Ligand binder design. Structure first.
Ligand code: CLA
Ligand code: CLA
Ligand code: CLA
Ligand code: CLA
Ligand code: CLA
Ligand code: CLA
Ligand code: CLA
Ligand code: CLA
Ligand code: CLA
Ligand SMILES: CC1=C(C#C/C(C)=C/C=C/C(C)=C/C=C/C=C(C)/C=C/C=C(C)/C=C/[C@@]23O[C@]2(C)C[C@@H](O)CC3(C)C)C(C)(C)C[C@H](O)C1
Ligand code: SF4
Lengths: 161, 40, 741, 178, 47, 180
């Protein structure tokens, strides 16, 4: 409904695309005989195509005039699954990765040989940091409040202005 | 095997290759079991 | 005396130096302080001459590294044979080669990439191959998959044996420098022992297993009823039924009645009408004659017995008035320096690969390979590229020898010294040659474009306005066409049908056809000459001015690869022989690209196509080369724009992979220009800003990040440029030829 | 003083086989010079033990089988691979062999473990050190016999098509005739 | 399931196939897992 | 001739866990020598947590076929289609309860160093003992070893129950009684 789009369930162009894909495979199907590995594999291909189209219809995606799904990314919760939920998932995973890296760097510097610790990873403690980074949003907030996330400004080199 | 071979396997490129192969395997198997997921 | 002397247990087998990454280099052994250490590790990984100072240790390392390379090559041959055995339609293709498309790779269904498993015929779905291995195995006589499986297992065993040998000859029993420097014995064994017995054994295999199986297959016997090779090997009755001369045994060989074997040892020439390829009897006779030639050649050089030549005296005896001492000292140079040997061997290997490319297309050696148009184009282009790369490696290692292993004491007044003493004249004359050749050759094209745009076709350098005919090429073609009667009486047909004669065709497709030369061929050949000459100019200047130049008298002190010698003297950028190689790689890329484009367009317009029953010849592009190859506009329109259709229109089909690789290769080629144009100072300042951003969050690494070195930036740009260009041409040629042929 | 093999008395002793059970000097092709004796002997004992079990199992399955497995010795492997009862052996023997490769790694690095010693001696046969050397030699003798025994079992079974004895039909009559 | 011992015999006697003529080398070579084109394909793990 | 053989795998060297004071150390079972790499206290904290979860799960999985919570909707005798059919906002509340317990018990101690930063803090000693069995120190070792063994057996038992249900499609008791 938004921006003149319509759901893919009642989308004639979407249905035509589904039938075109099905007809293309079934044509290619003529070369091979019944019961062969290629024949059964193409049957899997047709089933997966039909399943994908049915799932796209059921999920409530909006299909444009071209008959392809269009994703709405503005904040509306009617289409949260398009961007908002994957967005938070990625943000959590990326912060996990960054926190594991940062905490391992904090450890490795305190070591006697930080330069060799960077190219030969202490895996027993590195896995520990990867595990402990699961709670990074609280850990990051705690370190920020304790003044240990940011290095002060005049303790970092800066070039001649 | 030994401390030496464990250190070598703990070297940076070997660990990156192993970890990225594991990640690619996870992504590929997730694609196999939940194929064609355009949205949540 | 030539003898075997080795050191027992020279190195211990341990992982401590696996753990220690930069153990080999004195500077890198300390540890990393910047990210440049990581790059220097890989750059100096295989520089044994810089790592150590003992020629014995360098030779041992090189020998075992060669063993490792042989192991990798054996694994590669194993992959070819095993994939043919398991994931290929070789049986269907063997039953019906003309109709079935060869294919030996299957993709799994994961992300919809199963579309790449296109319809290749024979009830098989996979990715079409263009390596010619199917035709290779058909020539070899393999008719079933058990044979492919077992030779793959044998290749795996050989690869394991090579890895074991490489370990053994460095860690358990390493030879000595005295053993390594026995060049005369090495040449004797490689001529008589490697090449001679290799040719002899291949000739025996052909005569016993390949002629019968291929003759039966051409007659019409399906592969199931073919007698097995172990039966054919000892069943002399069947071999006599096929080739009657086999009933006479080996007495006509031991007595010199060699003419009795005329049936299976022939000199027919031409191409077999059935398979449209060279006669396998001719191939067997060829390899047998070469075996005799190489075994004869390999008894030249001296060894433990009195008889034999010595390369030292042979070289020292060759000196003339205009050369002073002549070839004195070159034996010592080539016995002491590995880089000189690498240079000569790489130059010959690359030129030989180019010769292989030029010969295989003109004389299709394997059955049903001529009609397999993707295979011919792929093999030609591949071997041309490998040849160019090897030639530039030859130049690079010649420069390395000049920088490192050169010394006037040994070369006082020899050919190397005399060449260095007039390098200026050499390079200036080659510079004039390059300017003259390029001006004339490309000005023909530009003149033609200008006249066509001005609407003056009568003023063109065309076949009908101002002809530039290749009279000498036409004369040589005429001589080669008349050769089988006059100058090669025992040969029944021409060596190649490209010079002239009949139009060999299998089914509808044309295997070979005479290639006519005209004005466009004149122009493109002179373009080839110009490109080769400029590449030689760059590489030869890099080699000659490696020691020093009028700009930097002490260039040798800086090293082989160094960024510059500062902005003094107006700027000394890219003065190194390494940078000369970096510039010459662009030029060989241009040369080989133009050569393969010429080959592709000429063969699709004038040889490849189909011939009807009435004799009508219809070509892929329709003979447009002779009239459209006269202008750069015609090259852009009728070759690039016209033949890019099959690539750009490939989405949603089996060639969608070729379309994707086309776009990705374009992307990488464009990406390379960043490194090629930009400079390290900008990127170092940008990295400083990013390092500040990381330090603000207390995660700046202990290994401080740095912009890549200047030499590394040039190398990265060149590598990405070459990868992008070669990938673009690879996808374009493969998509076009698979679609149309 | 020069040492000659007790099995090939026209060759010089290898000198790498010292201090091992079954040391008649049979090593004409000099594998001990290249590979380590610990690895070679662990392989020997593994082959010996697997071959003893295999030659007993082949003959046993020629006579008796469990109710679920109604296959002959030759097609038993294929039938049980299809059924999934060979994966259940490869998973529970592969666990054992994972522990085994850890063990052979340790003994090659010099932990103290012998070539093929796992310590598996529940019933106490040979716990006296005097009998252990003799029992080790007897183990090697029986295993090296069982290797040829199993090889003959399989090859003759396929070649003849006969169940237990692996003998041609004409060999069951007139085999002691003048 | 036939639990051997409680609801089934512990060990069933094997089928005695009787002593008879030998097979042919081609007969058991064109069905082997390593010297037969289809035997090789029947030797891939099904899984 | 191993100097310090493992009490469980006597053809392998003694792992670091064998020479330690946690409970059940003598077995010395560590063929992969993961006690050398992983922190030993952190792994007993994980072992005990997993065993406690699994020995709540295994009786639950085995008795949910027999018994139903009176009036519960979406009940199925087999756990897998049971979780498939049960309303999501019941599993969500169970997970929220578990998460609340975990967070409040492990407040400010979620990493290998932060947990066991306190020397007193023992592996798996979260302090849950309302009836105070731990005051009696004579049977503390017996109870610790019994907890460890029962937790391990419960992990294996729950794994077996779940995978047998996957194999058969039927609940644990039905699948078992259809063998005999
Ligand atoms: C480019 C500026 C901009 C910004 C910063 C936002 C920001 C937001 N919009 Mg969006 N929105 C925009 C333009 C923008 N909108 C426009 C132009 C439209 C009209 C089509 C909308 C229509 C819209 C709707 C209908 C809704 C949002 C909502 C939201 C919120 C999403 C919260 C979330 O999912 O997490 C967030 C405050 C959601 C909201 O209000 O959540 C409380 C919501 O339901 N927006
Ligand atoms: C950075 C940009 C970007 C983004 C945002 C995405 C996003 C996506 N890609 Mg990817 N993709 C990218 C780059 C990107 N891709 C590139 C560079 C390539 C070339 C190799 C691909 C090639 C590619 C393919 C071939 C496929 C995807 C698919 C997907 C989807 C994965 C969801 C999934 O299976 O989760 C599952 C997670 C859980 C169940 C948890 C998602 C919409 C898959 C899909 O389903 O697309 C609709 C798919 O088939 N992508
Ligand atoms: C008849 C005897 C003989 C034979 C068959 C070979 C064969 C070979 N030598 Mg040579 N070699 C010989 C005598 C011989 N050598 C002698 C007498 C010396 C001492 C003077 C050397 C010293 C020598 C060196 C220093 C090196 C070689 C190498 C090679 C390989 C060259 C690459 C190639 O074409 O591989 C073709 C491969 C095959 C045909 C596969 C078969 C491989 C083996 C023979 C099994 C090749 C395997 C190079 C190599 O690879 O080193 C490891 C190399 O660097 N050889
Ligand atoms: C290394 C290569 C090689 C090998 C291994 C063999 C092997 C064989 N050849 Mg020979 N052969 C070879 C090259 C080779 N040939 C070449 C180059 C020619 C061409 C002159 C011949 C021509 C030839 C003939 C004409 C005959 C053999 C035959 C034989 C057998 C030898 C009988 C004997 O020892 O007495 C055997 C199958 C005989 C045979 O058994 O043929 C079936 C036989 O009649 N060969
Ligand atoms: C017989 C072949 C041969 C041999 C034995 C050597 C040996 C050597 N060369 Mg090389 N060289 C060769 C061929 C050979 N070269 C060729 C054909 C060329 C022309 C291009 C060169 C050009 C050349 C130069 C210009 C230089 C060397 C140097 C060296 C030395 C160090 C190399 C090193 O450590 O690299 C270790 C390996 C690497 C650093 C990896 C290289 C990776 C390449 C650039 C890209 C690979 C791309 C891949 C195939 C495709 C990617 C696909 C994508 C989709 C992922 C060493 C003595 C250097 C030296 O100092 O010599 C004394 C040097 O400066 N060589
Ligand atoms: C299209 C792009 C282009 C052009 C035009 C040139 C041109 C040239 N390069 Mg090349 N070069 C290129 C790309 C190009 N390069 C790139 C991308 C690189 C980086 C890898 C290099 C790197 C490079 C090196 C390192 C070297 C060259 C050399 C040369 C010269 C070769 C000699 C020759 O034939 O001169 C003749 C001129 C041409 C072929 C250009 C077109 C000529 C037309 C037909 C007109 C000529 C007639 C008349 C005089 C002028 C027209 C009328 C006018 C008054 C309006 C020439 C000036 C070599 C050199 O200097 O050798 C002496 C050399 O060493 N180039
Ligand atoms: C090399 C060792 C070996 C191997 C690889 C096999 C393999 C096989 N045997 Mg077994 N088998 C073996 C030794 C071996 N056997 C021995 C020593 C015996 C004598 C007790 C048997 C007695 C036997 C019978 C009676 C049967 C099999 C069967 C089978 C098949 C199914 C697995 C099974 O139920 O085994 C069962 C194996 C055992 C009960 C023996 C377990 C004891 C082992 C050897 C360890 C002893 C030391 C502790 C399979 C092809 C079945 C089949 O398919 O027959 C057609 C079958 O019915 N085997
Ligand atoms: C839980 C299931 C189960 C049960 C209750 C039984 C019960 C029995 N089996 Mg067994 N049996 C089973 C599974 C079972 N079997 C399986 C899976 C196999 C296939 C490997 C066999 C193969 C088998 C054979 C070949 C024979 C029996 C026989 C027997 C009887 C004697 C048992 C004995 O001497 O124990 C002694 C106990 C031990 C040595 C301890 C073993 C290790 C423990 C259990 C751990 C008994 C009725 C015998 C029979 O038929 O008697 C009439 C008989 O000959 N069973
Ligand atoms: C890992 C633990 C676990 C998990 C994840 C679940 C999950 C589930 N159970 Mg439960 N269940 C468990 C253990 C578990 N159960 C145990 C141990 C029993 C006793 C045999 C039961 C008995 C049971 C029944 C009878 C039923 C379920 C059902 C369910 C489902 C709905 C929730 C519900 O009604 O719970 C009900 C929960 C209970 C009746 C009691 C749970 C016992 C907790 C875990 C013990 C912890 C507290 C501790 C002992 C007290 C300390 C005291 C101290 C302070 C002094 C859900 C799938 C329903 C079903 O079948 O849906 C398909 C259902 O009807 N469960
Ligand atoms: C010793 C040694 C080694 C070894 C070894 C080897 C080769 C060991 C081999 C052991 C072997 C061969 C062990 C078989 C067991 C079979 C069992 C338990 C069968 C169960 C069968 C069951 C539970 C059921 C069968 C059924 O038919 C029933 C009853 C009913 C039917 O409806 C169908 C089914 C299928 C359900 C190392 C590790 C390689 C090296 C080391 O150095 C030395
Ligand atoms: S950019 Fe590099 S090569 Fe050019 S003058 Fe500066 S330092 Fe020298």
């Amino acid at each position: 409904d938004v921006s003149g789009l319509t759901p893919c369930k009642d989308s004639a162009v979407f249905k035509r695309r589904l039938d075109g894909s099905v007809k293309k495979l079934n044509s290619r199907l003529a070369n091979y005989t019944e019961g062969t590995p290629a024949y059964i594999a193409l049957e899997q291909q047709i089933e997966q195509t039909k399943a994908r189209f049915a799932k796209y219809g059921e999920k409530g995606l909006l299909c444009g005039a071209d008959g392809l799904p269009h994703l709405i990314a503005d904040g509306r919760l009617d289409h949260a699954g398009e961007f908002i939920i994957p967005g938070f998932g990625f943000l959590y995973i990326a912060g996990w990765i960054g926190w594991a890296g940062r905490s391992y760097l904090q450890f490795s510097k305190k070591t006697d040989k930080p330069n060799e610790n960077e190219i030969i990873i202490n895996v027993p403690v590195a896995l520990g940091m990867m595990a402990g980074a699961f709670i990074w949003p609280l850990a990051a907030w705690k370190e920020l409040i304790d003044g240990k996330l940011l290095v002060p400004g005049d303790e970092i080199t800066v070039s001649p202005r | 095997m030994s401390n030496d071979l464990l250190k070598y396997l703990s070297t940076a490129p070997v660990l990156l290759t192993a970890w990225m192969s594991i990640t690619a395997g996870i992504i590929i198997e997730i694609q196999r079991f939940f194929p064609d997921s355009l949205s949540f | 005396k030539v003898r075997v002397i080795v050191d027992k247990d020279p190195v211990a087998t341990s992982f401590e130096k696996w753990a220690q990454p930069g153990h080999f280099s004195r500077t890198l052994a300390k540890g990393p302080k910047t990210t440049t250490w990581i790059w220097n590790l890989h750059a100096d990984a295989h520089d044994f001459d810089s790592q150590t100072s003992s020629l014995e240790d360098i030779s041992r390392k090189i020998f075992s590294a060669h063993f490792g390379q042989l192991a990798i090559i054996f694994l590669w041959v194993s992959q070819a044979y095993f994939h043919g055995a398991r994931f290929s339609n070789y049986s269907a293709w063997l039953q019906n080669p003309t109709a079935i498309k060869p294919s030996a790779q299957v993709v799994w269904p994961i992300v919809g990439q199963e579309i790449l498993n296109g319809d290749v015929g024979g009830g098989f779905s996979g990715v079409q191959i263009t390596s010619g291995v199917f035709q290779m195995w058909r020539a070899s006589g393999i008719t079933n998959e058990t044979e492919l499986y077992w030779t793959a297992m044998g290749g795996l065993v050989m690869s394991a044996l090579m890895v074991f040998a490489g370990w053994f000859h460095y860690h358990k029993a390493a030879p000595k420098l005295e053993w390594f420097q026995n060049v005369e014995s090495m040449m004797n064994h490689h001529l008589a022992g490697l090449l001679g017995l290799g040719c002899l054994s291949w000739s025996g295999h052909q005569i016993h297993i390949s002629l019968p199986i291929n003759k039966l297959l051409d007659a019409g016997v399906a592969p199931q009823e073919i007698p097995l090779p172990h039966e054919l090997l000892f069943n002399q009755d069947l071999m006599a039924q096929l080739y009657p001369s086999f009933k006479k045994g080996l007495l006509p060989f031991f007595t010199l009645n060699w003419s009795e074997y005329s049936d299976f040892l022939t000199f027919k020439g031409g191409l077999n009408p059935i398979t449209g390829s060279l006669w396998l009897s001719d191939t067997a006779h060829h390899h047998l004659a070469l075996a005799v030639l190489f075994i004869f050649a390999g008894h030249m050089y001296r060894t433990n017995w009195g008889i034999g030549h010595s390369m030292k005296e042979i070289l020292e005896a060759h000196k003339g008035p205009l050369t002073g001492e002549g070839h004195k000292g070159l034996y010592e140079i080539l016995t002491t320096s590995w880089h000189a040997q690498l240079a000569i061997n790489l130059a010959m290997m690359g030129s030989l690969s180019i010769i292989v490319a030029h010969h295989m297309y003109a004389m299709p050696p394997y059955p049903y390979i001529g009609v397999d148009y993707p295979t011919q184009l792929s093999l030609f282009t591949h071997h041309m590229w490998i040849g160019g790369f090897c030639i530039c490696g030859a130049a690079a290692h010649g420069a390395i020898f000049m920088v490192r292993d050169y010394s006037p004491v040994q070369s006082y007044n020899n050919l190397l010294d005399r060449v260095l003493r007039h390098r200026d004249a050499i390079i200036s004359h080659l510079n004039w040659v390059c300017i003259f050749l390029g001006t004339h050759s490309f000005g023909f094209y530009i003149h033609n474009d200008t006249m066509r745009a001005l609407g003056r076709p009568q003023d063109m350098f065309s076949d009908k306005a101002i002809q530039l005919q290749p009279i000498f090429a036409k004369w040589v073609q005429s001589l080669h066409t008349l050769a089988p009667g006059s100058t090669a009486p025992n040969a029944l047909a021409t060596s190649s049908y490209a010079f002239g004669g009949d139009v060999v065709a299998v089914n509808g497709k044309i295997a070979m056809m005479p290639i006519t030369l005209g004005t466009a061929d004149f122009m493109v050949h002179h373009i080839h000459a110009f490109t080769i000459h400029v590449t030689v100019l760059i590489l030869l200047k890099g080699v000659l001015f490696a020691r020093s130049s009028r700009l930097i008298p002490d260039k040798a002190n800086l090293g082989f690869r160094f960024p510059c010698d500062g902005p003094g003297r107006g700027g000394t950028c890219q003065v190194s022989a390494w940078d000369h190689i970096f510039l010459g790689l662009f030029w060989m890329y241009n040369c080989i690209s133009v050569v393969i484009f010429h080959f592709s367009w000429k063969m699709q317009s004038d040889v490849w196509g189909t011939i009807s029953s009435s004799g009508k010849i219809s070509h892929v592009t329709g003979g447009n080369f002779a009239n459209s190859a006269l202008t750069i506009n015609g090259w852009l329109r009728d070759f690039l724009w016209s033949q890019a259709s099959q690539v750009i229109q490939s989405y949603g089909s089996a060639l969608s992979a070729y379309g994707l690789i086309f776009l990705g290769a374009h992307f990488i080629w464009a990406f390379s220009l960043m490194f090629l144009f930009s400079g390290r100072g900008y990127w170092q300042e940008l990295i400083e800003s990013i390092v500040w951003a990381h330090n603000k969050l207390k995660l700046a690494p202990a290994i401080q990040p740095r912009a890549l070195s200047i030499t590394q930036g040039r190398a990265v740009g060149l590598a990405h440029y070459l990868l992008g260009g070669i990938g673009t041409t690879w996808s374009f040629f493969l998509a076009r030829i698979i679609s149309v042929g | 003083p020069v040492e000659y093999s007790e099995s090939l008395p026209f060759l010089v002793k290898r000198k790498a086989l010292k201090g091992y059970v079954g040391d008649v000097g049979f090593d004409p092709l000099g594998f001990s010079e290249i590979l380590p004796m610990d690895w070679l002997r662990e392989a020997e004992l593994k082959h010996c033990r697997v071959a003893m079990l295999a030659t007993f199992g082949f003959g046993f399955t020629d006579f008796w089988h469990f109710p679920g497995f109604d296959y002959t010795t030759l097609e038993a492997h294929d039938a049980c691979v299809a059924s999934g009862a060979m994966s259940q052996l490869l998973l529970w023997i592969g666990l054992l062999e994972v522990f085994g490769t850890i063990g052979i790694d340790q003994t090659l690095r010099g932990s103290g473990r012998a070539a093929g010693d796992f310590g598996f001696d529940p019933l106490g046969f040979g716990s006296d050190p005097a009998k252990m050397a003799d029992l080790q030699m007897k183990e090697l003798a029986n295993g090296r016999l069982a290797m040829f025994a199993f090889s003959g079992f399989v090859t003759q079974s396929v070649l003849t098509g006969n169940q237990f004895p692996y003998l041609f039909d004409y060999q069951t009559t007139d085999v002691f005739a003048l | 399931m036939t639990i051997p011992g409680v609801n089934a015999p512990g060990l069933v006697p094997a089928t005695k196939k009787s002593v008879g003529p030998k097979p042919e080398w081609d007969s058991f070579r064109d069905t082997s897992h390593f010297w037969s084109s289809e035997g090789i394909m029947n030797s891939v793990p099904k899984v | 001739a191993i100097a310090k053989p493992s009490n469980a795998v006597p053809f392998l060297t003694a792992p670091p866990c064998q020479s330690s004071k946690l409970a059940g150390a003598e077995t010395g079972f560590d063929p992969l020598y993961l006690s050398e790499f992983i922190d030993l206290k952190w792994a007993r904290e994980a072992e005990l947590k997993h065993g406690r979860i699994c020995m709540l799960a295994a009786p639950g999985y085995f008795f949910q076929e027999f018994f139903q919570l009176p009036g519960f909707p979406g009940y199925s005798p087999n756990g897998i289609e049971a979780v498939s059919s049960v309303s999501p906002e019941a599993l969500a509340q169970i997970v929220i309860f578990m998460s609340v317990i975990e967070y409040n018990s492990n407040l400010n101690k979620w990493t290998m160093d932060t947990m066991f930063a306190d020397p007193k803090r023992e592996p798996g000693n979260l302090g849950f003992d309302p009836l105070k069995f731990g005051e009696n120190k004579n049977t503390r070792a017996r109870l610790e070893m019994a907890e460890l063994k029962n937790g391990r057996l419960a992990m294996l038992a729950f794994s077996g129950m779940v995978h047998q249900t996957f194999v058969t499609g039927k609940p644990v008791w039905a699948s078992l009684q259809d063998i005999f």
